Amino acid sequence: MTIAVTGSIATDHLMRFPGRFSEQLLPEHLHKVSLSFLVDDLVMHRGGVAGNMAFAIGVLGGEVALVGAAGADFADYRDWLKARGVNCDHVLISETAHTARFTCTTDVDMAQIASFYPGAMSEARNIKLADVVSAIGKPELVIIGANDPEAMFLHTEECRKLGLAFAADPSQQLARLSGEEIRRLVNGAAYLFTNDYEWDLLLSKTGWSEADVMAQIDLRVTTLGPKGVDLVEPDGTTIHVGVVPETSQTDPTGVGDAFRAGFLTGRSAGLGLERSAQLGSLVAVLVLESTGTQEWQWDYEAAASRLAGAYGEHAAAEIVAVL
Amino acid sequence: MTIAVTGSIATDHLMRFPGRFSEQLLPEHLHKVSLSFLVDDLVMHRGGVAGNMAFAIGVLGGEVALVGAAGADFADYRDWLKARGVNCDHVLISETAHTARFTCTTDVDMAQIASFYPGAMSEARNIKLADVVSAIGKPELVIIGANDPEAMFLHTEECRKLGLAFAADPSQQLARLSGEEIRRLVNGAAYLFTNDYEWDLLLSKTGWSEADVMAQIDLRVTTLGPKGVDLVEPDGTTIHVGVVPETSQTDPTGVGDAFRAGFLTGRSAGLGLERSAQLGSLVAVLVLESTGTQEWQWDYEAAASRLAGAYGEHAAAEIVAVL
Numbered sequence: 172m173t174i175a176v177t178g179s180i181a182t183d184h185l186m187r188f189p190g191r192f193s194e195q196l197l198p199e200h201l202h203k204v205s206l207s208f209l210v211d212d213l214v215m216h217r218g219g220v221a222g223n224m225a226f227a228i229g230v231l232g233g234e235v236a237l238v239g240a241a242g243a244d245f246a247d248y249r250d251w252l253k254a255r256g257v258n259c260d261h262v263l264i265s266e267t268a269h270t271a272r273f274t275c276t277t278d279v280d281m282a283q284i285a286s287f288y289p290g291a292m293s294e295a296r297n298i299k300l301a302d303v304v305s306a307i308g309k310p311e312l313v314i315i316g317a318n319d320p321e322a323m324f325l326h327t328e329e330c331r332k333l334g335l336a337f338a339a340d341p342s343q344q345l346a347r348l349s350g351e352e353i354r355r356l357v358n359g360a361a362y363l364f365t366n367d368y369e370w371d372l373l374l375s376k377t378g379w380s381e382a383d384v385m386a387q388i389d390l391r392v393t394t395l396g397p398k399g400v401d402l403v404e405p406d407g408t409t410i411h412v413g414v415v416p417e418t419s420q421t422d423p424t425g426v427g428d429a430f431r432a433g434f435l436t437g438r439s440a441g442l443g444l445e446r447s448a449q450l451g452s453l454v455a456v457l458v459l460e461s462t463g464t465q466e467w468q469w470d471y472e473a474a475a476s477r478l479a480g481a482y483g484e485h486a487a488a489e490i491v492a493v494l
Numbered sequence: 495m496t497i498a499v500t501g502s503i504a505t506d507h508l509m510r511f512p513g514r515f516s517e518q519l520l521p522e523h524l525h526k527v528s529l530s531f532l533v534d535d536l537v538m539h540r541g542g543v544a545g546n547m548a549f550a551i552g553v554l555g556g557e558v559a560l561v562g563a564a565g566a567d568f569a570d571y572r573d574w575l576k577a578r579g580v581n582c583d584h585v586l587i588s589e590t591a592h593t594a595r596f597t598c599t600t601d602v603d604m605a606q607i608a609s610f611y612p613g614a615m616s617e618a619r620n621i622k623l624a625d626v627v628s629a630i631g632k633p634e635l636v637i638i639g640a641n642d643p644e645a646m647f648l649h650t651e652e653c654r655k656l657g658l659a660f661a662a663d664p665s666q667q668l669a670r671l672s673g674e675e676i677r678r679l680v681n682g683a684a685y686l687f688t689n690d691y692e693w694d695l696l697l698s699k700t701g702w703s704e705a706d707v708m709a710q711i712d713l714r715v716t717t718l719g720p721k722g723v724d725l726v727e728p729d730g731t732t733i734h735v736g737v738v739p740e741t742s743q744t745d746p747t748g749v750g751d752a753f754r755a756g757f758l759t760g761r762s763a764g765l766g767l768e769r770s771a772q773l774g775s776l777v778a779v780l781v782l783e784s785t786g787t788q789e790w791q792w793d794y795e796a797a798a799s800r801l802a803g804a805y806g807e808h809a810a811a812e813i814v815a816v817l
């Protein structure tokens with residue numbers, strides 16, 4: 172039943188400046204700035220695409236192993252994930268580098284100053300999926316999430332060699348990879364996940380037609396924001412599922428990851444394509460409506476009720492029957 | 495024998511950008527910047543003036559209690575200090591705020607973008623020194639380090655009420671406090687510590703003469719950078735001690751704190767003024783020569799040797815006799 176989730180593990184450190192950055196950005200000092208901002212809030216969110224996906228699968232009660240690279244400062248995050256049933260045995264802990272980190276300071280005018288530190292993520296290229304197989308047997312599915320790029324290639328190649336089904340889930344790496352690199356991530360995938368902007372980017376960079384892609388994969392999953400999700404099979408069957416209506420948009424971060432987790436959890440639990448997309452749509456809206464990416468709650472009763480509103484009582488009952 | 499060290503507890507998170515900030519600071523977007531820097535190094539240093547001083551006193555084998563406010567993220571820092579003999583029982587742990595943090599990103603041209611987050615430091619005003627006294631009896635000395643400003647006043651006032659000797663150690667808060675506020679921190683001090691710029695600032699903001707200050711305190715300690723330290727008593731005795739010559743200046747951060755720790759450790763161990771200043775000068779140079787503020791080692795043999803080079807074998811023997 173085990174899904175192995177590969178990809179980035181990171182935290183976001185968000186700081187608020189009550190002033191305006193522009194007050195310190197006069198031309199006299201742009202050649203060598205020395206900016207200092209007294210900030211009045213610091214929020215830390217657990218993230219990375221693999222952390223987000225593993226967290227969600229765990230919360231939903233799926234069998235899941237997180238496979239990525241982090242630093243010694245990962246310990247409290249490990250305990251957090253382990254509390255939700257995530258197997259973290261195969262998280263590579265760097266001896267020298269800290270866990271990847273996004274830091275962002277935002278002022279009162281919503282100007283931002285941001286950095287990204289890859290840290291230990293770069294060591295994901297040293298993880299061998301064979302070591303996972305030795306400990307837990309062959310995963311039912313390996314998710315190839317956004318990561319150290321070399322690690323994405325090596326993991327995908329190892330999946331093919333070892334006969335492991337994989338999901339191509341390159342998300343924000345599509346912009347950075349060459350057309351050939353993207354083809355190499357997609358050939359033979361059990362699933363391809365993207366949003367609709369990324370789907371178009373994929374076709375233009377690779378030079379593939381849609382038919383060429385569908386000759387390579389078992390299922391295309393293309394998210395459409397508020398317009399739902401398209402699922403396309405290589406036989407020409409298409410399924411479209413609408414969203415669960417939201418009651419707020421407190422933070423859109425992590426929504427794609429959440430969709431994927433819910434969908435794949437549904438598939439692993441034996442649900443059909445429509446029902447799995449419905450489940451993914453619920454998890455996605457819970458993440459949309461909450462701060463950060465792993466700060467949402469899972470309430471069986473509220474899930475059943477909300478699913479029934481969006482998709483009818485019959486569909487809701489079919490879905491919660493497996494949770 | 496117990497020194498209670500009040501003041502800031504913080505960490506420094508330092509990130510390196512291999513590029514130039516100026517490349518993203520064209521006039522077209524200064525009104526609402528969205529800067530993004532891919533950084534390639536992150537170094538975290540344990541600090542705060544009270545943390546630095548307590549660490550040093552502990553390493554030297556003194557009896558010391560750290561009294562300041564931090565967040566739940568203080569745990570690994572607690573264990574670090576406890577390993578060196580620091581009593582952390584009276585560190586107030588915030589339920590909502592993180593430990594104070596300085597974050598700084600530096601580019602290849604040594605331009606910097608920095609923030610300071612006070613966090614839990616602001617809750618130091620809720621610490622009661624009476625609670626320390628109840629647990630450990632009256633400290634021999636309470637250091638009033640740079641801190642939440644209200645906490646500095648409240649701690650000093652509590653010392654007078656409770657009959658506890660205190661060291662006025664306002665350092666970088668002198669620039670921010672009013673002349674009256676500074677007088678209120680200094681009246682009745684057993685010790686006043688500053689550097690020489692701060693000594694002049696103190697006299698000009700307060701309107702005191704040197705004689706007026708010396709009528710208020712038992713000892714003035716004024717550090718002079720590479721020119722050593724002056725110690726002045728209210729009877730008109732003055733002692734000047736030169737530095738221990740350095741072999742590098744890898745990082746000047748934390749040097750004042752280190753001097754204070756070594757000096758006060760010497761005083762608590764029964765050393766005279768000259769010898770205590772000699773000990774403080776050694777600890778100061780060890781911190782000057784090391785990255786960060788608590789990343790230096792303590793080697794009894796190398797200390798004796800280095801002290802003898804600077805001050806002669808007799809003085810070196812008198813000093814290490816108490817370590």
Ligand SMILES: Nc1ncnc2c1ncn2[C@@H]1O[C@H](COP(=O)(O)OP(=O)(O)OP(O)(O)=S)[C@@H](O)[C@H]1O
Nearest residue numbers: 366394395396397399400414423424426427452455
């Ligand atoms: N406004 C919305 N209301 C309800 N559901 C939504 C909304 N936006 C997105 N979703 C659900 O979230 C899924 C993924 O959203 P997308 O916006 O296509 O993902 P994405 O671009 O990868 O988002 P990020 O970058 O992870 S926030 C959709 O297929 C929907 O099921």
Ligand SMILES: Nc1ncnc2c1ncn2[C@@H]1O[C@H](COP(=O)(O)OP(=O)(O)OP(O)(O)=S)[C@@H](O)[C@H]1O
Nearest residue numbers: 689717718719720722723737746747749750775778
């Ligand atoms: N270049 C040096 N060589 C040897 N010892 C030094 C040197 N600079 C400082 N010291 C010692 O460090 C003590 C304190 O240094 P100062 O520079 O006066 O302190 P400060 O201005 O509080 O420094 P910071 O801000 O804590 S780095 C001096 O009294 C010396 O004993």
Ligand code: NA
Nearest residue numbers: 422458461463
């Ligand atoms: Na969110």
Ligand code: NA
Nearest residue numbers: 745781784786
């Ligand atoms: Na230093």
